[PDB]
């Protein structure tokens with residue numbers, strides 16, 4: 001007898017003000033009972049459970065379920081009530097590693113623990129709260145009582161305690177073996193090293209003995225799992241990673257759930273397969289509650305999907321992260337508020353890829369979207385590699401300079417360089433900060449009757465030029481935008497425009513290159529065509545001379 | 555040696571707050587730091603039975619190369635009960651904002667002696683994250699009074715008094731205030747004498763049992779307040795007068811007797827923007843009267859220790875920033891401007907962060923509490939980059955204004 005160290009139990013409480021589960025034990029068939037009695041018998045023999053007396057008020061229902069209609073039966077206990085009534089644990093399964101963040105190893109091995117798991121004892125004072133009863137045959141006898149001495153399978157607090165304990169155990173062995181690396185997921189431990197393979201095998205052996213010291217049984221034979229590993233949607237080789245292969249379904253009738261699963265597969269494959277376009281398909285899913293309704297593929301969706309299936313034609317591999325080399329992210333504009341990025345170390349070997357869709361605004365510009373994408377990639381890169389990448393961006397230094405210097409908001413991008421890979425991101429117009437000498441002065445106004453939705457838009461100038469246009473089915477904001485649009489249409493290459501609209505000014509100081517409103521876009525095109533434009537504001541109804549409320553208030 | 559009883563408000567549970575990503579160097583620094591903090595018993599490793607979490611990160615103070623552990627306690631601070639001590643509240647030293655000079659000192663280490671209430675510790679839990687979620691996040695809890703928590707200065711107040719008893723009596727001129735981990739020392743004396751008395755004070759701190767060798771020099775008497783000014787020109791264009799009228803019309807929301815009539819009348823007809831308009835008698839007189847109105851302070855502006863403080867910040871470009879502190883719209887308790895170039899010349903966010911810091915410190919000196927900020931920055935950008943530039947131990951609440959303000963130039 002070589003002594004094994006005890007595993008410290010984790011104190012557990014029920015949610016305050018509440019108590020444990022009470023549920024009437026469901027009647028079974030004689031068969032199910034006869035199976036469960038044997039199962040619980042040998043479990044009791046192994047120490048996973050124990051027989052208890054009538055003193056325990058708590059009963060959780062126990063079910064029998066045949067395993068694949070074989071000669072074996074298996075126990076299934078429904079803990080949902082206890083889980084509802086049990087406290088919260090800090091769940092350290094928060095997040096999972098991303099393969100791109102890992103460093104390659106010459107050797108990697110899996111150690112399954114389905115043994116050590118039940119070597120982890122439950123808190124003694126909490127044991128009475130897990131209690132199940134096996135109904136005897138015919139109910140002619142008092143049912144058999146049982147309680148858990150270890151972490152039950154499917155209890156709310158099992159994973160956290162399991163992982164905390166396991167970590168506590170692995171702690172010094174990791175510390176005194178700095179030349180290897182370990183990661184724990186579910187029932188599997190993952191060890192890796194750059195050691196010569198024999199040394200690796202003996203290291204794994206040493207780990208197995210180390211777990212044996214706490215009385216944790218390890219397979220004692222060769223493990224059936226070797227690289228590649230299928231893990232959480234990934235195919236993991238020691239020198240490379242990818243996603244478990246993505247194949248786009250060919251169907252004539254595309255339903256809502258079809259495009260749901262399609263955007264799932266695409267958003268999942270986007271991290272590696274570069275240039276995946278989710279836009280048109282996602283737009284077809286907007287506002288659709290019913291999963292059974294077939295929604296016709298737009299002609300903009302088909303040629304997108306045709307590029308998608310030509311992306312997934314031949315698979316591509318991601319590499320691992322080498323801390324000795326620079327970290328770089330490159331961005332491209334795909335148009336339509338979509339951006340595609342690739343994070344790599346050496347050219348054309350990508351650590352990973354990705355995409356960014358614009359936030360939903362009324363208006364927006366390229367530069368803002370580029371900035372937002374940069375922030376996204378930054379945060380992602382801090383999560384994964386722990387540092388901020390070097391950016392290669394489709395924007396001239398000068399453009400960025402003008403933008404951030406003149407922009408009303410504070411804005412920043414980390415260290416970056418201009419890559420010339422069209423389409424380039426640019427500023428489409430720039431408003432003068434001073435009134436233009438020699439340029440005609442257009443005083444514009446618009447107004448609308450709120451009751452009849454009728455109104456007018458127009459302008460008067462210093463050169464005598466005037467216009468007023470009637471508008472039906474329109475609003476004050478609309479008429480006041482239309483006024484400016486008119487002043488832009490009818491004016492030469494340089495123009496000064498006075499407006500009383502805080503709204504129009506509010507829109508134009510946001511410098512959008514695109515908008516939901518075709519009117520605003522028309523104005524944008526107009527500005528783009530212009531040489532110099534000075535937009536000036538005055539308060540309404542203060543009788544500012546030249547601002548004419550009399551023509552459009554009729 | 556005896557812990558003072560501490561609890562939360564009724565119905566409010568402990569903070570469960572997401573830990574945001576940290577870079578590698580900050581993770582290293584926090585690992586080393588928490589390692590040395592465990593060996594000193596200030597913190598202790600915890601198990602899965604502790605659900606609560608509070609964010610933690612790393613900074614560097616003024617002109618110092620040593621990393622510092624900053625726990626962001628805001629959620630816990632607002633979830634912890636309003637702590638009214640034996641002090642019955644501090645009658646905040648309005649003499650502090652009147653002082654010729656004020657020095658800010660870091661006393662935080664003094665908190666690490668006093669033990670924390672045994673039952674309250676589960677609410678202080680924080681997590682040192684790992685890169686790429688490869689290893690489980692390391693978890694500690696505080697056995698002592700944590701820096702950044704509202705209850706720490708509250709608890710340590712009574713003993714801080716009897717620590718500072720001889721000094722306050724030896725120097726009846728000097729005013730001493732305490733906010734979070736910082737201690738503010740006001741005086742009417744000279745800079746050199748200030749430095750000497752500060753050295754004596756930190757030695758006095760070292761003798762009473764407690765990086766406290768740092769200090770910050772502020773000058774409330776030289777501090778920035780602003781009135782509203784209108785141009786003085788010998789000739790006005792149509793544009794000049796349009797801007798003027800706009801600004802006056804804006805000021806009318808504040809000052810009662812503003813009249814724009816005679817100035818607006820000049821604009822009559824549609825003139826070109828660059829055309830010069832001579833000022834009439836009525837116009838000039840009206841302008842003069844408006845200036846007269848503007849020279850006076852604002853009628854009946856009162857502070858309310860109950861109500862919130864709000865801080866608006868506008869980017870004026872060229873490193874220039876303007877700001878206002880208020881409670882109700884168009885009542886300004888403080889207004890100012892910040893031009894500082896230090897390390898920030900090419901970076902807007904660094905500037906804005908230093909601006910928020912300065913403004914907050916000012917708020918602390920004047921009213922003894924921090925304002926609620928409205929920042930001219932996208933939530934994503936700020937939230938990404940602010941912790942890199944942050945040198946102060948406290949943190950203010952904030953929000954993000956997405957609409958460009960028209961009033962931007964009216965403060966410039």
Ligand SMILES: COc1nc(Nc2ccc(C#N)c(OCCC(C)C)c2)nc(OCCN2CCOCC2)n1
Nearest residue numbers: 102103104105108181182183190227231236237238
């Ligand atoms: C098992 O843990 C671990 N694994 C690796 N690499 C590594 C490389 C190849 C495979 C395969 N197949 C692998 O598989 C085991 C793990 C999982 C996630 C299935 C893991 N690198 C590390 O360490 C990288 C941590 N560094 C990141 C940069 O800062 C310093 C720390 N840790």
